[PDB]
């Protein structure tokens, strides 16, 4: 049953909204998805493998949504251009808060996680740099910092700032404030200087 893989995926996501990975059992997910402990293993080698797939979909979904924006350029000013771009991440991981949070914590313990995050971060930082450059090229943005070291810092900022907000960490920018907050700093620092 593929239908059964999905039910394990929905169950985990659900159970993570109320408790941490270390507090969810394989039995929880099985019972949850309506199958036995040993049938669970037919789909996944572990619970961590379940978190992994979940993060992968979310990440892949943000990525796929960013491609779409790239291919259909929104007809607007530069400020909004950037805002639409940041919003893929605000919306995408904002609708998957429990997965975001657990997926970030797993980086500390799990190599596939740390490496999945790390690949996409490289990928989105590389895309940020190309756009910054293409902007410097048309004479819209000045040549200040290395475009790649700039992309890097901006992406890491957003990582940490979006996620602290979703968690309501303290301190954090309020979730209703974060988007405008992040866009102001991208835009001033790219066109300024």
Ligand X SMILES: CCCS(=O)(=O)NCc1nc(-c2ccc(C(=O)NCCC(F)(F)F)cc2)cs1
| Residue 192 touches which of ligand X, a second copy, none (Cβ within 5-8 Å per kind) | a second copy
Distance from chain centroid for Cα 132? 21
Among 28, 48, 63, 159, binds ligand X (CB under 6 A): 159
- Interatomic CA distance for residues 65 and 140, integer angstroms: 25
Sign of CA dihedral 34, 2, 46, 16: negative
Per CB under 6 A, 173 contacts ligand X: no
Binding span for a second copy by CB under 8 A among 4-12, 40-48, 131-139, 151-159: 151-159
Of 128, 165, 178, 183, the one binding ligand X (CB under 6 A) is 128
DSSP label of 22: G
- Give min distance, CB of 166 to a second copy, in A: 13
Note whether 73 binds ligand X by CB under 6 A. Answer: yes
Question: Two tokens at 136?
Answer: 């410097």
Three-class SS state of 31: helix
Per the CB < 8 A criterion, the answer to whether 147 and 133 are in contact is yes
Quickly tell me which residue has 């300024």 as its tokens.
192
For the bound state, the minimum distance from the C-beta of residue 125 to ligand X, rounded and expressed in Å, comes to 7
Residue numbers at the binding site for a second copy (CB under 8 A):
105, 108, 118, 121-122, 125, 144-146, 149-150, 152-157, 159-161, 164, 169-174, 177, 180-182, 184-185, 188-189, 191-192
């Amino acid at each position: 049953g593929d239908d059964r893989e999905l039910a394990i995926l929905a169950t985990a996501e659900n159970l993570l909204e109320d408790r941490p990975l270390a507090d969810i059992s394989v039995d929880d997910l099985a019972k949850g998805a309506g199958i036995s402990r040993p049938t669970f293993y037919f789909y996944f080698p572990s619970k961590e493998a379940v978190l992994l797939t979940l993060l992968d979909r979310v990440v892949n979904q943000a990525d796929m949504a960013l491609q779409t924006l790239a291919e259909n350029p929104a007809d607007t000013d530069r400020e909004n251009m950037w805002r639409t771009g940041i919003n893929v991440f605000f919306e995408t991981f904002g609708s998957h808060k429990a997965v975001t949070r657990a997926g970030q914590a797993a980086r500390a313990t799990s190599v596939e996680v740390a490496e999945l995050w790390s690949t996409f971060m490289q990928k989105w930082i590389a895309y940020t740099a190309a756009v910054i450059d293409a902007e410097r090229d048309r004479g819209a943005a000045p040549r200040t910092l290395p475009a790649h070291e700039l992309a890097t810092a901006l992406n890491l900022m957003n990582e940490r700032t979006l996620f602290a907000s979703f968690a309501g960490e303290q301190p954090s920018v309020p979730e209703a404030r974060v988007l405008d907050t992040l866009v102001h700093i991208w835009v001033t620092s790219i066109y300024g200087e």
